[PDB]
Write an enzyme that holds these catalytic residues in place. Structure first.
Site, PDB file in Angstrom:
ATOM      1  N   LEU A 291       0.807  -1.227  -0.178  1.00  0.00           N
ATOM      2  CA  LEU A 291      -0.168  -0.019   0.062  1.00  0.00           C
ATOM      3  C   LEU A 291       0.728   1.108  -0.142  1.00  0.00           C
ATOM      4  O   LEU A 291       2.195   1.216   0.060  1.00  0.00           O
ATOM      5  CB  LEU A 291      -0.941  -0.053   1.149  1.00  0.00           C
ATOM      6  CG  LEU A 291      -2.125  -1.119   1.172  1.00  0.00           C
ATOM      7  CD1 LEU A 291      -2.684  -1.354   2.563  1.00  0.00           C
ATOM      8  CD2 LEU A 291      -3.182  -0.584   0.037  1.00  0.00           C
ATOM      9  N   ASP A 292       0.261   2.337  -0.101  1.00  0.00           N
ATOM     10  CA  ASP A 292       0.826   3.821  -0.214  1.00  0.00           C
ATOM     11  C   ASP A 292       0.967   4.254   1.013  1.00  0.00           C
ATOM     12  O   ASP A 292       0.124   4.074   2.312  1.00  0.00           O
ATOM     13  CB  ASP A 292       0.287   4.389  -1.323  1.00  0.00           C
ATOM     14  CG  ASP A 292       1.012   5.854  -1.504  1.00  0.00           C
ATOM     15  OD1 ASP A 292       1.711   5.859  -2.566  1.00  0.00           O
ATOM     16  OD2 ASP A 292       1.100   6.783  -0.871  1.00  0.00           O
ATOM     17  N   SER A 293       1.748   5.334   1.004  1.00  0.00           N
ATOM     18  CA  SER A 293       1.863   6.203   2.260  1.00  0.00           C
ATOM     19  C   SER A 293       0.249   6.987   2.643  1.00  0.00           C
ATOM     20  O   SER A 293      -0.063   6.916   3.551  1.00  0.00           O
ATOM     21  CB  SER A 293       2.818   7.318   2.153  1.00  0.00           C
ATOM     22  OG  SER A 293       4.242   7.053   1.659  1.00  0.00           O
ATOM     23  N   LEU A 294      -0.333   7.496   1.713  1.00  0.00           N
ATOM     24  CA  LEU A 294      -1.533   8.124   1.652  1.00  0.00           C
ATOM     25  C   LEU A 294      -2.569   6.906   2.177  1.00  0.00           C
ATOM     26  O   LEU A 294      -3.499   7.201   2.924  1.00  0.00           O
ATOM     27  CB  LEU A 294      -1.978   8.798   0.308  1.00  0.00           C
ATOM     28  CG  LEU A 294      -1.560  10.231   0.044  1.00  0.00           C
ATOM     29  CD1 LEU A 294      -0.132  10.293   0.613  1.00  0.00           C
ATOM     30  CD2 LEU A 294      -1.799  10.431  -1.146  1.00  0.00           C
TER      31      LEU A 294
ATOM     32  N   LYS B   9       2.480  13.249  -6.777  1.00  0.00           N
ATOM     33  CA  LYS B   9       3.121  12.210  -5.860  1.00  0.00           C
ATOM     34  C   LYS B   9       4.582  12.210  -6.453  1.00  0.00           C
ATOM     35  O   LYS B   9       5.435  11.686  -5.642  1.00  0.00           O
ATOM     36  CB  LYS B   9       2.330  10.837  -5.627  1.00  0.00           C
ATOM     37  CG  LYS B   9       3.174   9.816  -5.242  1.00  0.00           C
ATOM     38  CD  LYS B   9       2.380   8.492  -5.059  1.00  0.00           C
ATOM     39  CE  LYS B   9       3.139   7.436  -4.513  1.00  0.00           C
ATOM     40  NZ  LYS B   9       3.543   7.368  -3.139  1.00  0.00           N
TER      41      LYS B   9
END
Ligand SMILES: CCCCCCCCCCCCCCCCCC(=O)OC[C@H](COP(=O)(O)OCCN)OC(=O)CCCCCCCCCCCCCCCCC
Ligand SMILES: CCCCCCCCCCCCCCCCCC(=O)OC[C@H](COP(=O)(O)OCCN)OC(=O)CCCCCCCCCCCCCCCCC
Lengths: 94, 276, 168, 126, 86, 111, 62, 12, 75, 113, 177, 154
Positions: free
Chosen positions: E40-43, K51
């Site tokens: 998954l991503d940081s966000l 991003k």
């Protein structure tokens, strides 16, 4: 981000200690070792009423101007008890 | 007294709109009603002002009790943005709340009516400041507006509360007092208004519009608030408004006074009297 | 209670004259009261008064003979001045109580006359005004150290002003 | 930015130009400040958790604050034109102002009473 | 108002995560990392933290939340905050 | 009037009873919230009687209970003025407070 | 009493019937009082048109 | 089920 | 506390469906809709109306009104 | 409205609420009879009517008060008396409105040259 | 709360904090869940568009512009969790959080009402007494040579050792006493 | 406490400045005394005039409600800036904008009240009429005297 190994290990150890402490907080079955209806109406609404009515009738009603009431309303056609006067009726209108 | 009451009514009725805290909305409603009583006293109607005191006690206490029940049933949540659907999930508290809200507004023949209707009639049929009268009527509309705000955002929506549900009205200590206050909010105004001795001479001769102004403005406020609330579901972003901010931040009176006055006072008390 | 000091007009209560089929709750509540509450209290009070009848004692209202006034003896005679000052303090303390009696009269009249106080308390209000003027002319503007000498000085100044005005 | 700070509405941090500077100088300064905080916190926590402790933890910073605001004010006071002007004005100006207020009020009242025009009606207590 | 339990907290956390499109309900375990394992991503981690806050009606301070990278970590944090295991 | 004055003073006596009970050991042996709620309820019931009398005859009373101190031609004495406003507000407030005191037993039960 | 998760709870008959009774009593009172005292809401007396009173009635001399 | 509640010493 | 089966929660037939439709029209997708779908599904489904909320109890109020009016007419 | 005419049109033809009546009471009224008061000063005093309530309908207000006192505890048995009193007050209000209209008509009559 | 802040935040941390705050305030603006989901997806699209930005100056410039926009469009009265700072019921239960050391002054009569609790408490105090010296020694030896220190504390390295400075972290009053 | 751990006179030299910073547990670069205007401040540092409301609320401060750490230098006006008193936190609306809006609202309201007073709202009605010489005696009239008759007509 993320816990470093030292952070993770310290958190685990503190978690163990805290959970044991919280468990020790539990009370035992014997723990609180304690050491060896008109009743309300008569108790609170009758005896105090005796005292209050006594005080009124025999310390407030006997003093001058201690209890003063506005004059009762008199309307044309009424009979005064004390003097027996009958208030004359009103004039007739259309 | 007339001018001060009119100003308080308008200001607190404005502040009540755009308030996301049930207790805060009810408190601002109380302030608005007190402003209305002060207007009634600005007119020579002291008996009518006292009658409004006695009538308003009932349904204001009922509203606060209902809000307390809702807040207790939810995990101590007071913001209305995390409520909704209470009309279905809490039938009894919702019904009592709606009774109290209609009583607060000028719903005919409820405890509020026998004071608010006569106050508005006397305001219209008297020699008064034009601005005081106008803003008093606007505030009488804003009362229904923020009542509709509460009703809509705490009853007529989908549930916004956390997913785990533990709601229990079923307790006599909760149910009985609210039932008593509801009987009050429905009948006490009538009973008192009939039993009390004649106090002043009302003016019952006025144009139809002056007579029905209370109902008309209350219904207009209800409809306008309903339209604005329905417009919230439209998928258009709400942009900050200067007047919306003025309402939300309480007109900036706290933010300015509670910072400038104490700062200067305490700075004097230290730098001048004590040190210098 | 002396009616001459504390005048209380005669009551004028109208007859019941009911005109409805319902029972008046207040009459039955008053009956229940006169039975439960009024009767045992009356019996207890009668017993107390019977006990008072025995062991009966009398107390008297002290009488003070008039002594020479401040005007009647010489500057610097501390004995005279002390006697006269104590007498003046007694009379001042009694003037205060007369003031209080008349104020009570006025307040009772206002409450009784109720809505007619603007028209049926004329006697009490006029008495208050006159007795108030007298009190002001006697005692008003004397220091916290008011004394017979200050009262005499005030009276003499007022008399001098009145005499000068009468001459003019 | 459209937000203009005031002394009582200070500038936020997210709008602060000095919060977005990554210069090694500022980074060293911040690290040194954190080091001081860490040393002080370590000492405080050692004292706090000391099981043999039998009293409260004396606060040198609080002692310094109280000493500065009480006993050290005068030793470090030097009269200046501004100090003297402010002292005289604050000390006396209010007194002169209120003297004039009270004296004018009393004189007008006394003139009224002397002329007999003051309506002292039920004044009996004074 | 039932007091929270370790098992209940774990069940609700995994419920919320299973209701997440970016995570396949299988291959999701208590010890499954969000980035190393689930990719998954940081966000996405911030969104997961916000979802947990919405679920449990309380806030994770950003500093503590940024370090919560596995469901077991989240369960332990909630447990420690609420003083669950008496 | 004896009945009217007795009711007016008995309201205060009943309200003061719970305050005194809280200074004795009986507060640990009784259910204090329920005792106080009952006291408020009975004060309301008692107050309903002066209200009825005022509705009937519309008379207003001045009741001097106690002479506190006399201050040179100004007597400060405890006095109650029972007219339309006081008589109606007492009953309304007692009703509201009965309801809220019962409600608090539930709202603050944990506290 | 049963805490349910993400599902509409179970409503006891007591609360439902009591809320319904309160609402019904409110609406019954409103309807009754409006039927019997509609004047308090609409108007008691006919507001006269001041422009129709005749000059003879108002004592206006020519 | 019943947790000890820490209180100050009210005995005195 | 036995949780309901998460397979239950869907997006279709709810306003979340229209939200997803608009997001797709923009070229985006919402990975959390099934976490809110319980608010719109089940016993929480259906829209409340201000008429309904205000007039709750009106049927029985009017029935009682008719009964009382008939009784008064009879007497 | 009267306010619109006073504040936007010619204000010199509108009554001044303080100065009503302005013209002599007998203009255009060769025969004018004085207002009649049924209830006496003594009757109003005995009935304890407030000075605000001691107007020309005091004779109806006295009946209303007597009926209330007699009917009690039945507080809904005076609707007829109350309607009589309110109707008398309405007639008094209509008389006041007639006074205002007479003042306006005379003021605009004074618009002679 | 449990973790101590660093000397500074990195760009990633600042951006994540801004993202969380922006989404919370967007939820406050859009009261309804469906509307919030729609606008939150749009906001994440905006965040993702940038991003990838390897110009660490155009990254800070973007962040500062975003912060200006956030301060411009923030909810005047956002939504605060009831227990969080600024929220109703924040410090509501600090009156009942009596610290553990208050039990030392209990009269023997009061301790006789909880015989087992104080029996266990004595064991806890004995454990603390035994551990203290070793934990202070562990901290003293762990101290870094260079002055760059942090508030982060070490775990128990040997066996039978409690983590240094554990007594207040443990034994702290419960959230809802 | 020795005399060297307590606040002293204004630092005259960089040596004294460094010593003062060491005493106050502050970086030499951060330390900044008050202006040497002889107002008694002496050596005490000047910290930013920021209320305790603005400190991090999620941190574990040693002085929890003061939001200060043990040993941290205390602001000269700490008792003014405590969380109970003066608040200086940033605002969604700038200070001047808030002041302008509030004062404008107040000024508009007062002006409109004056306008309403000038143009009062009333009904097309004559004055209320009272019998018996406008209730001469009831309103407190003098019995012996005779009022100037006031007659009410139809
Ligand atoms: C508290 C404030 C209460 C003020 C009223 C005082 C009542 C108690 C009292 O003073 O009783 C005095 C009574 C008669 O004595 P007294 O009036 O002083 O006459 C002789 C003077 N040398 O003699 C007595 O001491 C007792 C009289 C026998 C009956 C008991 C008295 C009960 C009275 C209760 C009602 C008092 C009014 C309550 C008002 C409450 C307001 C908060
Ligand atoms: C048209 C009509 C126009 C009318 C204009 C009226 C102008 C205002 C007059 C009232 C003055 C009151 C000033 C102080 C009010 C105040 O500051 O109290 C509340 C405040 C609490 O701060 P708060 O913002 O509420 O906190 C919220 C959560 N953080 O409290 C504080 O923060 C500090 C509390 C400590 C204060 C101690 C020192 C005294 C403060 C100064 C009082 C000045 C009183 C002036 C009176 C003037 C009129 C006589």
């Amino acid at each position: 981000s993320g816990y470093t190994p030292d952070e993770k290990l310290r958190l685990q150890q503190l978690r163990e200690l805290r959970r044991r402490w919280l468990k020790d907080q539990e009370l035992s079955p014997r723990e609180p070792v304690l050491p060896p209806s008109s009743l309300f109406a008569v108790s609170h609404v009758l005896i105090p009423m005796w005292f209050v009515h006594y005080y009124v009738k025999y310390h407030m009603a006997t003093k001058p101007y201690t209890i003063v009431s506005s004059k009762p309303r008199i309307f044309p056609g009424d009979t005064i008890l004390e003097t027996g006067e009958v208030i004359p009726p009103m004039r007739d209108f259309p | 007294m007339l001018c001060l009451g009119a100003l308080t009514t308008l200001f607190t009725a404005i502040c009540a709109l755009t308030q996301n805290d049930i207790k805060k909305i009810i408190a601002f409603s109380t302030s608005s009603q007190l402003g209305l009583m002060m207007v009634t006293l600005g007119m020579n109607q002291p008996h009518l002002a006292f009658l409004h005191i006695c009538t308003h006690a009932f349904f204001k206490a009922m509203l606060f009790m209902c809000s307390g029940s809702i807040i207790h049933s939810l995990a101590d949540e007071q913001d209305i943005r995390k409520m909704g659907n209470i009309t279905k999930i809490m039938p009894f508290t919702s019904s009592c709340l709606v009774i109290g809200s209609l009583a607060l507004t000028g719903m005919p023949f409820l405890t509020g009516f026998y004071s608010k209707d006569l106050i508005i009639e006397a305001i219209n049929t008297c020699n008064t400041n034009a601005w005081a009268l106008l803003i008093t009527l606007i505030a009488t509309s804003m009362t229904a507006m923020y009542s509709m705000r509460i009703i809509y955002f705490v009853t007529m929506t989908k549930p916004r509360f956390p997913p785990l549900i533990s709601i229990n009205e079923n307790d006599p200590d909760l149910m009985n007092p609210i039932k008593r206050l509801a009987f009050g909010s429905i009948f006490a105004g009538f009973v008192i208004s009939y039993n009390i001795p004649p106090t002043s001479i009302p003016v019952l001769t006025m144009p139809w519009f002056l007579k029905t102004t209370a109902l008309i403005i209350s219904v207009l406020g209800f409809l306008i608030a309903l339209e604005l609330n329905n417009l919230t579901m439209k998928l258009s972003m709400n942009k900050a408004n200067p007047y919306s901010s003025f309402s939300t931040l309480l007109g900036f009176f706290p933010s300015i006074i509670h910072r400038i006055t104490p700062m200067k006072s305490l700075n004097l008390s230290l730098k001048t009297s004590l040190t210098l | 209670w002396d009616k001459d000091v504390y005048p209380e007009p005669p009551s004028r209560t109208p007859a019941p004259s009911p005109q409805t089929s319902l029972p008046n709750p207040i009459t039955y509540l008053t009956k229940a009261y006169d039975l439960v509450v009024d009767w045992p209290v009356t019996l207890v009070r009668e017993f107390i008064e019977r006990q008072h009848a025995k062991n009966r004692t009398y107390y008297y209202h002290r009488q003070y003979r008039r002594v020479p006034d401040i005007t009647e003896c010489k500057e610097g005679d501390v004995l005279c001045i002390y006697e006269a000052e104590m007498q003046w303090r007694r009379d001042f303390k009694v003037d205060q109580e007369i003031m209080n009696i008349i104020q009570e009269r006025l307040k009772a009249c206002q409450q009784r006359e109720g809505e007619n106080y603007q028209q049926n308390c004329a006697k009490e209000l006029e008495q208050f005004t006159k007795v108030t003027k007298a009190y002001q002319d006697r005692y008003l503007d004397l220091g916290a150290y008011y004394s017979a000498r200050k009262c005499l000085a005030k009276q003499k100044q007022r008399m001098l002003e009145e005499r000068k005005a009468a001459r003019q | 930015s459209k937000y203009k700070p005031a002394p009582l509405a200070t500038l936020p941090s997210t709008l602060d130009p000095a919060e977005y500077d990554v210069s090694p100088e500022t980074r060293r300064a911040q690290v040194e400040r954190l080091s001081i905080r860490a040393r002080l916190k370590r000492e405080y926590l050692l004292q706090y958790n000391d099981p043999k402790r039998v009293s409260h933890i004396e606060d040198p910073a609080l002692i310094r604050w109280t000493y500065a605001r009480s006993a050290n004010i005068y030793p470090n006071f030097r009269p200046t034109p501004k100090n003297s002007l402010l002292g005289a004005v604050a000390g006396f100006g209010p007194l002169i102002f209120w003297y004039y207020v009270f004296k004018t009020d009393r004189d007008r009242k006394e003139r009224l009473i002397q002329e007999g025009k003051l309506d002292r009606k039920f004044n009996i207590s004074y | 108002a039932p007091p929270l339990t370790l098992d209940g907290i774990k069940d609700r956390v995994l419920y919320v995560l299973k209701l997440y499109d970016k995570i396949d309900p299988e291959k999701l375990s208590v010890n499954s990392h969000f980035m190393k394992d689930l990719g998954l991503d940081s966000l996405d981690q911030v969104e997961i933290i916000m979802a947990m806050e919405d679920e449990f009606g309380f806030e994770i301070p950003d500093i503590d939340a940024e370090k919560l990278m596995c469901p077991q970590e989240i369960v332990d944090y909630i447990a420690d905050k609420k003083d669950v295991y008496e | 009037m004896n009945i009217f004055t007795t009711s007016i003073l008995l309201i205060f006596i009943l309200l003061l009873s719970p305050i005194l009970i809280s200074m004795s050991n009986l507060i640990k042996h009784i259910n204090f919230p329920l005792y106080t709620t009952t006291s408020i309820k009975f004060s309301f019931i008692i107050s309903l009687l002066p209200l009825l009398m005022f509705f009937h005859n519309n008379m207003e009373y001045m009741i001097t209970t106690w002479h506190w101190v006399t201050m040179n031609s100004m007597e400060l004495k405890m006095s109650f003025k029972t007219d339309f406003f006081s008589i109606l507000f007492t009953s309304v407030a007692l009703f509201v407070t009965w309801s809220i005191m019962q409600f608090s037993s539930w709202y603050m039960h944990s506290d | 009493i049963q805490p349910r998760y993400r599902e509409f709870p179970q409503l006891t008959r007591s609360q439902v019937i009591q809320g319904e009774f309160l609402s019904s009593l409110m609406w019954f009172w409103i309807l009754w009082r409006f039927w019997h005292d509609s004047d308090a809401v609409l108007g008691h007396f006919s507001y006269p048109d001041p422009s129709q009173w005749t000059d003879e009635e108002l004592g206006i001399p020519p | 089920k019943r947790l000890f509640v820490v209180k100050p010493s009210l005995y005195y | 506390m036995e949780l309901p089966d998460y397979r239950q929660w869907k997006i279709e037939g709810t306003p979340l469906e229209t939200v997803q439709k608009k997001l797709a029209a923009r070229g985006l997708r919402d990975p959390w809709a099934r976490n809110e779908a319980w608010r719109y599904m089940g016993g929480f489904a259906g829209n409340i109306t201000f008429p309904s909320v205000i007039l709750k109890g009106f049927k029985w109020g009017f029935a009682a009104f008719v009964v009382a009016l008939g009784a008064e007419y009879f007497l | 409205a009267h306010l619109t005419r006073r504040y936007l049109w010619d204000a010199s033809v509108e009554p001044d609420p303080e100065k009503i009546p302005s013209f002599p009471p007998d203009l255009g009224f060769p025969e004018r009879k004085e207002r009649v008061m049924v209830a006496t000063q003594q009757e109003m005093m005995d009935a304890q009517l407030t000075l605000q309530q001691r107007d020309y309908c005091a004779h109806y207000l006295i009946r209303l008060l007597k009926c209330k006192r007699d009917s009690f505890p039945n507080f809904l048995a005076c609707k007829h008396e109350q309607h009589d009193w309110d109707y008398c007050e309405h007639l008094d209000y209509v008389k006041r409105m007639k006074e205002f209209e007479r003042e306006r008509r005379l003021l605009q009559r004074k618009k002679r040259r | 709360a449990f973790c101590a802040p660093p000397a500074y935040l990195t760009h990633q941390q600042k951006v994540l904090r801004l993202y969380k705050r922006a989404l919370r305030h967007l939820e406050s603006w859009c009261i309804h869940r469906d509307k919030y989901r729609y606008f939150a997806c749009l906001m994440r699209a905006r965040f993702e568009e940038h991003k990838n930005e390897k110009d660490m100056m155009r990254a800070t410039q973007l962040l500062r512009e975003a912060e200006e926009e956030f301060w411009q469009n923030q909810h005047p009265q956002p939504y605060i969790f009831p227990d969080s700072p600024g929220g109703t019921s924040f410090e509501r239960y600090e009156c009942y959080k009596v610290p553990e050391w208050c039990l030392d002054y209990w009269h023997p009569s009061e301790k006789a009402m909880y015989p087992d609790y104080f029996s266990k408490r004595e064991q806890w105090k004995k454990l603390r007494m035994e551990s203290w010296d070793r934990e202070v020694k562990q901290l003293q030896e762990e101290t870094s040579p260079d002055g760059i220190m942090t508030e982060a504390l070490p775990p128990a390295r040997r066996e039978g050792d409690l983590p240094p400075l554990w007594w207040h972290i443990v034994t702290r009053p419960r959230e809802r006493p | 406490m020795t005399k060297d751990m307590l606040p002293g006179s204004y630092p005259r030299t960089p040596e004294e400045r460094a010593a003062a910073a060491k005493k106050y547990n502050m970086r030499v670069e951060d330390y900044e005394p008050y202006p040497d205007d002889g107002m008694g401040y002496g050596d005490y540092p000047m910290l930013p005039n920021r209320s305790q409301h603005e400190r991090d609320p999620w941190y574990q401060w040693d002085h929890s409600e003061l939001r200060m750490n043990w040993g941290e230098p205390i602001h000269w006006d700490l008792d003014m800036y405590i969380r109970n008193r003066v608040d200086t936190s940033p605002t969604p609306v700038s200070w001047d904008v808030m002041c302008k809006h509030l004062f404008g609202f107040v000024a508009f309201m007062v002006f409109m009240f004056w306008v309403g007073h000038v143009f009062p709202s009333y009904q097309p009605v004559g004055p209320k009429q009272y019998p018996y010489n406008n209730l001469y005696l009831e309103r407190g009239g003098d019995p012996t005297k005779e009022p100037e008759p006031v007659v009410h007509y139809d």
